[PDB]
Amino acid sequence: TENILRKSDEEIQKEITARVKALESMLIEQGILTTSMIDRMAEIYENEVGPHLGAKVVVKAWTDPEFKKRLLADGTEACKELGIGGLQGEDMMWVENTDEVHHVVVCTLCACYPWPVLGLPPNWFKEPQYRSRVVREPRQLLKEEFGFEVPPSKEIKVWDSSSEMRFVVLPQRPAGTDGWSEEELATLVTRESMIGVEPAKAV
């Protein structure tokens, strides 16, 4: 929104940069931070951990009802079967979209998010507009923001992750995908669909 008090995005970024570099130099001189330590964290979450990991679970549950049971009973343990887990998904609870229930996930208090299956959250998930409104007007918010129309008779359950428990939506498998390979089905699974803000891709 417009704030007549607010510097330019350029002036903001330039100030932040000098401040981070100054703080970085002090932590370097303390011995607690290195360049290689910064690269490795950034490589992990740019190219290693991402929502492709979550899609693999989803298409496994879509195609393996016994795995789907184990996923919904203990999400951390089930994801461990595929070599998926770790920081910020140490406690995962997966919740299944049905014909009667739609699930959407938020962290109203900060920005918590299941890193091992979705990677770092997009900026809109961390910001005050989504976080403030989704607990209050989920049905209107899904239609206006994401064009996702949930019929008035279907229940919407909003999960506000206030603890270290991490909620992840298991989206409903799209109609018309009978017999699809796991690879082919994964193309339909999106970050948005495992947050609850969109269904899986159609067709």
């Binding site: 932040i16 570099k21 130099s25 290195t34 360049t35 330590m37 950034a42 976080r131």
Partner: protein
């Protein structure tokens, strides 16, 4: 605390800004702020709950409109000075150096394999918060419970929109690190954790959807029994 960060149920924050796509890190400084988390954690600047409390003491207008990872910088500085590990006047002098010499080099330093070992271990093994306790859970699924009306000044996970509200326990999760002590430097003091379901009409009055519910995680002392 009753800080602005506790935004659930707030109106008038504006429409969601959502580019059709965006990079993980929007600028080099963001990679740095990000990697500084494991670095200050291992050095004993703070833990997870304490980290979140530093962000919660930010100036509210800045919190609301600054870049996300700038919040992380603020909390780093907060606990750096709190523990005495960060000398402010030095920090300010160096900021003005890098304002004026943005391409100057960083301090010479040696690479440390144990810090890579640390990173990898934390990313793939995690930092699990679950704990074992000698006391059994007080509550159980189906119990009708009421959320505490206490309004502590320190860290806690007591969103203002749920306080004094009534819901039904949905699941007990085991015992976990307790924000209200951990975030305030007072140790883990683990407590049983439960998800609790609140109808939208319980939350928002008549303005709530009649077919919608909010699920919210509560540590045992947050909730007291209404009906078993």
């Amino acid at each position: 605390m009753n800080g602005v960060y506790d935004v659930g149920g707030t109106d008038g924050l504006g429409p969601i800004n959502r580019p059709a796509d965006e990079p993980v890190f929007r600028a080099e400084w963001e990679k740095v702020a990000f990697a500084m988390f494991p670095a200050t954690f291992r050095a004993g600047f703070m833990g997870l709950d304490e980290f979140r409390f530093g962000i919660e003491q930010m100036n509210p207008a800045e919190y609301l409109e600054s870049p996300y990872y700038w919040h992380w910088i603020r909390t780093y500085i907060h606990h750096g000075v709190r523990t005495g590990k960060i000398d402010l006047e030095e920090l300010e002098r160096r900021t003005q150096y890098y304002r004026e010499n943005p391409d100057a080099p960083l301090p010479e330093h040696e690479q440390k394999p144990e810090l890579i070992e640390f990173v990898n271990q934390a990313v793939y093994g995690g930092l699990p918060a679950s704990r074992e306790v000698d006391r059994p859970p007080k509550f159980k699924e189906g119990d009708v419970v009421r959320f505490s009306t206490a309004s502590p000044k320190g860290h806690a996970r007591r969103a203002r929109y749920v306080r004094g509200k009534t819901g039904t326990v949905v699941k007990h999760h085991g015992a976990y690190i307790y924000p209200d002590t951990a975030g305030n430097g007072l140790g883990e003091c683990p407590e049983h954790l439960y998800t609790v379901r609140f109808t939208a009409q319980e939350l928002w009055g008549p303005e709530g959807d009649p077919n919608s519910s909010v699920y919210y995680d509560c540590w045992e002392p947050y909730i007291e029994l209404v009906d078993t």
